[PDB]
Amino acid sequence: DTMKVINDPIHGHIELHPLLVRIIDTPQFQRLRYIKQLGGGYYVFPGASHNRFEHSLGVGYLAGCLVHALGEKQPELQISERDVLCVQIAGLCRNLGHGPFSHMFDGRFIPLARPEVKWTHEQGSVMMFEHLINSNGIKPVMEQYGLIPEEDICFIKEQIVGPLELWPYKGRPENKSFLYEIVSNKRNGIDVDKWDYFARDCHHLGIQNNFDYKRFIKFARVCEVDNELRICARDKEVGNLYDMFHTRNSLHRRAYQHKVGNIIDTMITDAFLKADDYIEITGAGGKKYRISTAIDDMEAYTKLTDNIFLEILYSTDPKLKDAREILKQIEYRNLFKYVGETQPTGQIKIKREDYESLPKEVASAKPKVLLDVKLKAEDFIVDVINMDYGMQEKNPIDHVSFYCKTAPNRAIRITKNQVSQLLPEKFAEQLIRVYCKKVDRKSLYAARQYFVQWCADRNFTKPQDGDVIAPLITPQKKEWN
Amino acid sequence: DTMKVINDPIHGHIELHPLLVRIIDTPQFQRLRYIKQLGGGYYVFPGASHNRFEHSLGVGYLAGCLVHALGEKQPELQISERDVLCVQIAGLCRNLGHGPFSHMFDGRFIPLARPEVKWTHEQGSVMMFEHLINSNGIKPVMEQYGLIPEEDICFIKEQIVGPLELWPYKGRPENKSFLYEIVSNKRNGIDVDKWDYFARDCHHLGIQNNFDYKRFIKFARVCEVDNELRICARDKEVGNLYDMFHTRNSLHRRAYQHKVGNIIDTMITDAFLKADDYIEITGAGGKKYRISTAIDDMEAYTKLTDNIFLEILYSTDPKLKDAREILKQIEYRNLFKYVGETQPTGQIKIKREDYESLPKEVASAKPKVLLDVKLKAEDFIVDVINMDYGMQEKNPIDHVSFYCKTAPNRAIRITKNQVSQLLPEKFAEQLIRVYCKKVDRKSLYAARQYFVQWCADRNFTKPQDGDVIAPLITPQKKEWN
Amino acid sequence: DTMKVINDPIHGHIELHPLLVRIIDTPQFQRLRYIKQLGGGYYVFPGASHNRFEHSLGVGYLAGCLVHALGEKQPELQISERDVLCVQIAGLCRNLGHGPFSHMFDGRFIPLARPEVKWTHEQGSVMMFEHLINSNGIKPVMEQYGLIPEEDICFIKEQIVGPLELWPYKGRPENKSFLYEIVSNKRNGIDVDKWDYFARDCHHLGIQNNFDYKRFIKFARVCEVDNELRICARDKEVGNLYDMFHTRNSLHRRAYQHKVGNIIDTMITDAFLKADDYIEITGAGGKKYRISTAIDDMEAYTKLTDNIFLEILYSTDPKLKDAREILKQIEYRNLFKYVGETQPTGQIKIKREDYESLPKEVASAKPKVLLDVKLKAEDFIVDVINMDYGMQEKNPIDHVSFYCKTAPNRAIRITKNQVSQLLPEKFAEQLIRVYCKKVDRKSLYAARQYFVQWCADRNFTKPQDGDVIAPLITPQKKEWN
Amino acid sequence: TMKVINDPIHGHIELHPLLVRIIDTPQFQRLRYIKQLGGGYYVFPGASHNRFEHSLGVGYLAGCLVHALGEKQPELQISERDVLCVQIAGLCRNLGHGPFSHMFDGRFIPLARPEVKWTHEQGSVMMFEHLINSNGIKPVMEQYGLIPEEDICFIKEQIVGPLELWPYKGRPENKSFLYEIVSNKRNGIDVDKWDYFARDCHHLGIQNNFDYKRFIKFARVCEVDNELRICARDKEVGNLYDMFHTRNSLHRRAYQHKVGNIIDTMITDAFLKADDYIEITGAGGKKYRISTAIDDMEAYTKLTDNIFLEILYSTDPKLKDAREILKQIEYRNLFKYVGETQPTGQIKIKREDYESLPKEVASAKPKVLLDVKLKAEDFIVDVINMDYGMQEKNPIDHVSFYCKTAPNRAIRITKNQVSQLLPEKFAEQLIRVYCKKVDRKSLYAARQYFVQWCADRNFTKPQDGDVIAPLITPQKKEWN
């Protein structure tokens, strides 16, 4: 059993250690071939056909590169081949828990189908990894390559989902803390997962990013902070780190939160909810599950992928008619109509409990205009998107350590006004999109009136095309000229 | 309504006339989102997740570009917007007939399952297009934008499949003959389908494209040739044209005919053959069809995509067990073993009717090696591959017309001797790959002995690793020494 | 005289009209092959070997593309072939006036060698262009192609530098106002010049470009604004527009204002100063000129290129001993040492009239630490960089007109709060870099103490490595630590 | 300390301080002023890259290959000293290039110094010696664990071959594979090629189809004929053929572009007419000509593309002629391409026949009525040898391969074992004819002369033959 080489368009020829090969050649890993990275985004960007599989290969590769580079530059860290392999496996397996259409499933479907439970794709990754190991005889292969199953499996899980419950990690001591910053960085969000999806998503979407992860790896060091060994960036790179997050935000603005892509994720979520009772997925022993309950049994979850979209589309049963028809609306491109975008003002934000009261509000506005129809709450969709730098209101660069050329072992901090005045003032904000399920001319005119009026009543930002879609409405708001 | 813009990672922003949008937004066309361009190639090249949908868009785009450029450079040709639109539609629609995993379906599955039928994906494209037209109310929409459905539908079909039966075409007169050279070039095979797949497949496989189609388009012109108007190329580009085909060959050698990709297509085909008596696909009138019979009913064929792979894989029915098992062999990477490659020598050419008897020849070989395993004919797979420049044994550049700078309307011919002595001396050859369905070490050893002996017996070429995998066989053959 | 095609790595195959061909093949234009786009940047980024020549080709090409797109989308604008050609000529010729090492010349050398005159590369471009036209008999070729030299030459120069002085233009009337927005946009800075250098500089530097100019071109219209027919962008694009400026900023930060690249431009500049009495360039009639004076005779300026750097370098004349030695220090990489970067705080704005006072202040600072060596004013360099969005303190997007899909001919305005709260609050800032000419250790320590103390006294931002380069000085400033 | 350089081709490359010290010398920095493709820049405007960045690239790739070999196979005993020597060799193998690169050693020198045997290789060795001596590199080398006597010899041998049975001195036979990296005299597969494939493609606007990273990943060292040599994996053989095919393509499209070559020729002519009058100052203040600068490394250090601009800008009337040719380049008044043909049969044209060629063309007697009579000073005949790097031989016959099943056993693979669609021949010649007189009538004449000549010598029919000379072509029965 030898290394295999895989050719990836992003990273080139990637070498895979035989243990990694063993992990990859399982139903649990191969499942990721049938889950689109960007979910419904493929229906807007036809280049975005990539799946979580190739992305995961990429993450394992980059984890390997960063750990090896650190060990190579700093022998005093005593990074072992075992550490390298463990970081590699963590990188390969942190996407194991994604469901159909990726972030649609944990972001939209699950919270609606099962409001009581709090599921994340990370927990799904830990559970799925445990099921892969246990179902495929991986433990003895691990020990066969000088890994210690007990400690190392724990380590892998921890890298993926953080502490399983003062130094909180049991997989590795403080003197190897930096290993936990590579795959999924809880501290500042700077990790190789972001790097792979930046490059890969850009390559498939046909839009480009200027973040250079290779450069970052070149200047990465391990230095001591707060009695921990942590990864530090070279000082002169601070400007680039800021740009990194800018790139993230840009990618969210252009692709990941494209209004139509989001409405397609919403319509698919909708079809999944109408189908949940009727689609049977066989789990362990023979117990049958639903889409919403498959997350309870990894055997059933292994068979839960993008495929059910087509399963719903191709079905003939009356019980699935309503599900089916929605999907067909997607095929005919009869999508819900986008009405518009606005934002709250001040330090006023919309929290999660108010999300379902919003269609009603939009429907409750009184545009002093004569309409041919009346719309009700059920006719509107209100989608609230949080855009941030990955730590709510915080600046993540406040949580990065730097080192300078004159004392490369000394960690320091760099504040925002040590860098530039042209940087953002805040680091979190909310976008509000409104869509109408009635797609005829009249109803959409009406919808625009209700919408702009609702914006005026709540002192939100003036829609960019406000003066065009509601000329009778905008003048009442003097703050809009 | 109005035109749309699509961002494609290969061509950038592609503009779509609303009629094209109407054609694309149908089940018949959207179907192509669920058919991988390279079929089983994705299982070897993880970047190759692209489907026939995006490829089809790219082809329609390029057909548009070429006809437009011709029109702009030579107004005397009288190309109308109607012509442009019909060529764009043909470009968009020549891929409509592809089945699950593309060339696996018409190259491997149909020939085995329905050997009495002479099916091609092109015919499939014509029937599927007829069904899209009729099921989606397209004719009046065509009339609305200035097209004449009778004639123009004829024209499109002819561009896809050739004459539906001296001028054999009824969709356009001889003075527009060059328009038939764009989408699917029956004369020499230089068309825009190739250009799109060169660039897109290369972009996704992580292999770099050598061919510059924009350059070609800039130096394309129409000239009179044998009382016919044809697309001719600038003389200086003749080398480039040769390189084009070289590229095609290279792509076939590295990717499209990859030994493992091919064995994967073969295993999927085997599974389909074993699932064929059980999978039912509802056609028109609620009539039932099989995977093998879907091609007789466009309503059923519409529902026949890559999804069946998963339908088979997730099935619980005992009667599907076998098929299911084969697919599971794929997930665990327990694939049929590659034994070797050889070629015929002299002027021996393997006939299509001789294919079936080949594993029997191999099993009946008598290698002088001691073996603890005897293999039967049914243990061997023999895959015969015809590699050519697209016109069997002919040089396609002998079917290209050129023009000179000084006389831009005088068509000429250029022979291979006028170009280089470093070019191929033949334009077709056969590659014979042998595989073994028994994957154990002993079986693979024995299979290697049989294979090399069979090569010796038939005076085929010495396998590249012959001296290594069969050191006791290769000495007997003096022509190899 | 027919069309030529040029292959360019950025744009691919550029078609050049015979008139542009005749303009390009002159000494005046070919001169640009010998002037590096990024001056001293090549000494830091080895891929940046590109010259002003190819950039000029790119700019001309894109100007052509934009005017052409505008014309095909809106025939009512009556754009003529004349217009296309003049916009192309302006695009081709707007870089004609650059001098040795590009921005080094008009940005450092001329302002120091000739404080009394106000000169810029744009004026250089108009003068050079006039010279080209008259020395090469271009007017009759222009007339041969249907141009009208009187108004068209004016139109071209106007596009390059603006009004030569109510509507202030002679070349074209108000209903063609948008044509003045293409090559050099004096209203908001969005023009094709920027687009070409984004793409080209990124290609050569090894940094990736994230601005998509083809998308912009595709979404651009012409609308009525304040009695003028201006170019408007789709509302949707607003985010991207902001990103466009961000990119510009990033490119300045990473490459164009690189500390070492700037110090190299400085050393080259003062070498030119040392050589300014002693080098002779033969001008019109046979007169002699200096490097600082070739600016006054176009025939002399034609021979002023990067070549001069080598003249000095290769010289043996004792009169040039000083200059020469400096260039040699660049060859051995014995450069002035960088000691730090800081910014002003509050409302403080370092004026040009004060630059000269800066090295004296640093030498005047009294650090309060043990120094082995004293440094004087001559030992310091202070470089002041003005970073902005190209309109000083103003937001350029406030000066951009938009349109919505609902009523495409209806120009509108978009404000910053209508886009994002994560945007810059300020659109201009200043960076202050300090270097020391004395390069030994002790000198460097000294320079660091002086510098940090100076930042402390001037109430400037605390240097990033401040606690490391001068620990004994930093705790005296309460706002800092 | 170490330095990081951002290259558009390879990304962020790390240079050891020793390499930095070698690089920060006038002898090395000189390469910033010499264009990789010379006159090619006047046809492909993206092709502005110089030898400096290419040299960095070659150094980097040499380091990559030797390091990969070392990591996969510890038993080879590759030391950091070996690594450094191979890097230095890659970094320095382009040091001997003159103005406009291959124009200088390919066109100028053979016409100006026909008695000398000169290669950019020899110049690289001499320039390396001079660089080492003029900058005190030896003690820096010793400082980083190098042994100057052995190692300098090793580097020179890597660049130019043996200096004159194991013919090498810098390293023994068990390190033979080290000699296959920077300049492979055995089959021509080396990192120099790989770098220029990628860089030239990047700047030309043509896409490279050879994947050298894949090659590096698959390369191993195996024992072959009592040497340890680099071996490629068997199944890569196709790709190897493609590599040479790629080389040929690049020559067809760019390096041997008709107009690119005529521009190189015009520049050469200008240098020839300038050579008696340009003065370069070398050691001891002594003076040298362009054609003699190669005899003194101090003066060669100052010999770059700048010469072009020194000639164009000159005011000295002695340099008038020279200056006027370059000016015609600026006005795009170039010698006119009349056509391309090829020898048939076993006929092969040798260098010593070259100068006789314009004479034969002017002596041909086209049976058409003309207006001007052309002479043998109005014609230019350029002869191009296109091959796979080893004249008539197949370089793949000089590659060692290994198989997955026995990775330490080297094997050979023949052409017939790979494909019948491969070339039957591995070398050929292209004959281009240009005319120095650019009027329509002289051009028509030149065409008639050219085709008549092609017929007389039984050469191949020019591609535009029927068009540029409809009265000449139907005579030659073999073209019909």
Ligand SMILES: O=c1ccn([C@H]2C[C@H](O)[C@@H](COP(=O)(O)OP(=O)(O)OP(=O)(O)O)O2)c(=O)[nH]1
């Ligand atoms: O010319 C090629 C051939 C293959 N690949 C890719 C496909 C795959 O992702 C990786 C490895 O395939 P390869 O053919 O090298 O390995 P293999 O099929 O498993 O052969 P073997 O087991 O004999 O090493 O390289 C390329 O990029 N270029």
Ligand SMILES: O=c1ccn([C@H]2C[C@H](O)[C@@H](COP(=O)(O)OP(=O)(O)OP(=O)(O)O)O2)c(=O)[nH]1
């Ligand atoms: O910043 C962006 C936004 C979108 N796209 C792509 C996505 C899509 O393939 C195409 C068009 O999307 P767009 O957002 O422009 O169209 P739309 O969503 O239909 O908006 P509208 O109907 O209002 O024009 O361009 C980009 O490349 N970059």
Ligand SMILES: O=c1ccn([C@H]2C[C@H](O)[C@@H](COP(=O)(O)OP(=O)(O)OP(=O)(O)O)O2)c(=O)[nH]1
């Ligand atoms: O295979 C090629 C050949 C040329 N070029 C470039 C070189 C140049 O930048 C442009 C045009 O050169 P071309 O050879 O096509 O024109 P020409 O030399 O002037 O020949 P002719 O006058 O017969 O058209 O195309 C390529 O990119 N690829």
Ligand SMILES: O=c1ccn([C@H]2C[C@H](O)[C@@H](COP(=O)(O)OP(=O)(O)OP(=O)(O)O)O2)c(=O)[nH]1
């Ligand atoms: O954001 C950047 C900055 C620089 N470079 C390039 C330029 C150069 O080729 C190489 C190294 O430059 P750098 O600025 O990192 O090194 P330096 O100027 O020598 O700084 P220092 O000596 O303090 O490490 O990286 C980039 O690619 N991106």
Ligand SMILES: [Mg+2]
């Ligand atoms: Mg394998």
Ligand SMILES: [Mg+2]
């Ligand atoms: Mg994350």
Ligand SMILES: [Mg+2]
């Ligand atoms: Mg839309």
Ligand SMILES: [Mg+2]
């Ligand atoms: Mg075809």
Ligand SMILES: [Mg+2]
């Ligand atoms: Mg030409």
Ligand SMILES: [Mg+2]
């Ligand atoms: Mg430095």
Ligand SMILES: [Mg+2]
């Ligand atoms: Mg060589």
